[PDB]
């Protein structure tokens, strides 16, 4: 009784320290209000707002349906480890929430 949030297992942070991975979910026809949060930056994707993490400059996100292509930039080595993606579908009521097993982001 929750949505099937799918992260990738281990993620290899990039040259300048920018990790990118897709966070997919399964009952994904509730697309109007869709807040996505990152736990070890968060934004709410609607129609008025289409590229998120405006208030979280270290993060980049592009929504389409059952996949969210994600980007955390500026990651140090002192940050490596467990990264989690939470998919809230605030509309229609009633909410329909989910969380993923996490991502080991190893910041070489």
């Amino acid at each position, epitope marked *: 009784e929750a949505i099937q949030v799918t992260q990738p297992s281990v993620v290899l942070a990039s040259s300048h320290g920018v990790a990118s991975f897709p966070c997919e979910y399964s009952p994904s*026809h509730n697309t*109007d209000e869709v807040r996505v949060t990152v736990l070890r930056c968060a934004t709410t994707f609607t129609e008025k707002n289409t590229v998120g993490f405006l208030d979280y400059p270290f993060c980049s996100g592009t929504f389409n349906e059952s996949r969210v292509n994600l980007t955390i930039q500026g990651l140090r080595a002192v940050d490596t480890g467990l990264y989690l993606c939470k998919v809230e579908l605030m*509309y*229609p*009521p*009633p909410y*329909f929430v989910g969380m993923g097993n996490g991502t080991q982001i190893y910041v070489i």
Partner: antibody, heavy 117, light 113 residues
Framework: EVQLQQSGPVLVKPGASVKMSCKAS????????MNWVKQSHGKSLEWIGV????????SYNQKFKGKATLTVDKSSSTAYMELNSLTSEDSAVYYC??????????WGQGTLITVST | DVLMTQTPLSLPVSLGDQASISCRSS???????????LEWYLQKPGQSPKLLIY???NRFSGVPDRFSGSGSGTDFTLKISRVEAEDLGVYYC?????????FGGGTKLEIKR
């Protein structure tokens, strides 16, 4: 394509209870939410509530919170609404209708509940 | 609770003219996410309702191009341009923004021949 099949008409004596069905076909019953809409003989429509079949969550129209109890059953692709303390003003046409970018985008043919002595 | 009051209640219109219905909401219909959730349903006689316009001005698949929505805040308008015999019935606006979700009273569109 999508088809919603509701139970037939039920004559229930007052004070009893009735539970009706909506049998989803041509789509994935758990994928989209589901509403029940009441249409008295006085023509105008009313929203009772919505239930997430994948889950069982509901959001109810506070003025129905006690009169109606909506419930789903994933193995049958069938939703259920149940009405306690059936009165005379509880007699209406009851509709199931499934979300799709819009609240009532697919409609059931309707269950006519007559509450007589 | 948000009241939806339509006008007219009856509305005779000859095939080929332009019918136009008005829905007025007690309080704004714009939701917090920024979307605005007005819907236009048409109940042909002895049929269940059928969806016509969602999110104010959007035509659900199948609805002819004669049908159109417009509005913002507390005032909205469905307008059939060039009416046809197939269009007779009752036309309901419905808001799905604020709980509880309510309907308008309806607008019986009659044909004149």
């Amino acid at each position: 394509e999508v088809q919603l099949q509701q139970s037939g008409p039920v004559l229930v004596k007052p004070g009893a209870s009735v539970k009706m069905s909506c049998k989803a076909s041509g789509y994935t019953f758990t994928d989209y939410y589901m509403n029940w809409v009441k249409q008295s003989h006085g023509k105008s429509l009313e929203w009772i509530g919505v239930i997430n079949p994948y889950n069982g969550d509901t959001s109810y129209n506070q003025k129905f919170k006690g009169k109606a109890t909506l419930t789903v059953d994933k193995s049958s692709s069938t939703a259920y609404m149940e009405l306690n303390s059936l009165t005379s003003e509880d007699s209406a046409v009851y509709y199931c209708a499934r979300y799709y970018g819009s609240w009532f985008a697919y409609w059931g043919q309707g269950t006519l509940i007559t509450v007589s002595t | 609770d948000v009241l939806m009051t339509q006008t007219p209640l009856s509305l005779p219109v000859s095939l080929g003219d332009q019918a136009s219905i008005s829905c007025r909401s007690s309080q704004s219909i714009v939701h917090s996410n920024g979307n605005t959730y007005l819907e236009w349903y048409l109940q042909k006689p002895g049929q269940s309702p059928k969806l016509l316009i969602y999110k104010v001005s959007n035509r659900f698949s199948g609805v002819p191009d004669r049908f159109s929505g417009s509005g913002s805040g507390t005032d909205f308008t469905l307008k059939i341009s060039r009416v046809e015999a197939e269009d007779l019935g009752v036309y309901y606006c419905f808001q799905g923004s604020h709980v509880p979700y309510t309907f308008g009273g309806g607008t019986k569109l009659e044909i004149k021949r």
